[model samples]
Target: SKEDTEITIQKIMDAVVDQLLRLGYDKMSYTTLSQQTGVSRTGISHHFPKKTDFTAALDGRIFKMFIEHLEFEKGLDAFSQSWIKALEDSEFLAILRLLFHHIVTSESAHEFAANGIDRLYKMVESQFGSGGDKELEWLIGRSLIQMSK
Candidate 1:
C-alpha cells in the first residue's frame, strides 16, 4: 500500500542521510541501507534502483541542512559572513565531496553529481538573487574549486 511505502521510506531516508554524511556517497550501499533500516535490500532497491534516486529524492533535505549554516539576511556585501564557517560542518563538507566532484566513473554517479549541482545550485541562486551576476557566479565558483581537486 502507498501508506506503508511512505512510512518505510522515512526510515530509509533517515539512514540515507546518516550514511551519506558519515560513511560517504560511494561507501554506502543498498545492502548497508537495508541493514541500517531493517528494510530488505531488494525492497529498498525497488524505490532507489539507481543510486542517484536517493540524491534526487532528498535534494530538499540536503539543501535544508546546507543553508542552515548560511545567513542570507546579511545581504551581498556580507555575503561571505558565514561562508568559510559552513565548510567546518559535516553536512556542508560532505555535500561538497559527494556532489561537487567530477566522478564520471559510474554512469549513474554522473547523474548523482549533476542532479546535486542543479538542486544545490538553485538553492544558492534563489537566495543570492539574480539581480547581480557575480554574486551567484562567485557562489558557484566555490563548487568549481571543489571539482578542481
Candidate 2:
C-alpha cells in the first residue's frame, strides 16, 4: 500500500508542477490541482495539508533535480547550457518568474531568496572555481536587492 501511495504522490506532484507552470504560484489553488490531477480535494489535502507543504515539497524536488544535472555535467559551458535548458525545458521557467514575486511579497520570503542565492553561489563556484566567491557573493547580494525592489 505504501508503494502504491508513493506512486500516487509522485503523480500528484507531477500534476502540481504542471499546474504551477500553467497557472502560477498564487493562482494554482487546491481546487485547480484537483481539476488538473483528476484527484479529489480530499486526496490532495491528505498529502499537502497546506499550500506551503506543497510548495516546500516542490522546492525540494526542483533543487534535487537541478543538483543531479549539475553533478552530471562536465564543465562551465555544459553547466551554462544546463541552466538555460532548465529554463527552457521545465517548470523551472515558471519558478524563475515567480521567484521575484516571492522575494518581494513578504519578509519571510527573504529566507527563500537567501537560500536561492546560496545555491547559485555553489553552482557558480563549482563551475568557475572559488576565486570569485567574494565577488560572486556581492553580485548575488546586489542582484537580490535589485530583485526585491
C-alpha lDDT of residue 54 in model 1: 84
- Candidate 2's clash total is 0
Model 1, 1-149: lDDT tens per residue?
98998998888889998898899888899999999988998999998887878876775787677777777787755656466556667677787677654354567667666666566556556776655356555665675564454
- Best by the lDDT measure: 1
Q: How good is model 1 by TM-score?
A: 0.77
Off by over 4 Å in 1: 102-105, 115-126, 129-149
lDDT (10s digit) by residue, model 2, range 1-149: 88988998888899876776678778888898888777889998999897756656666666664455442346655655555445444455555555556666766545665677677777678668775466555543544454344
TM-score of each: 0.77, 0.64
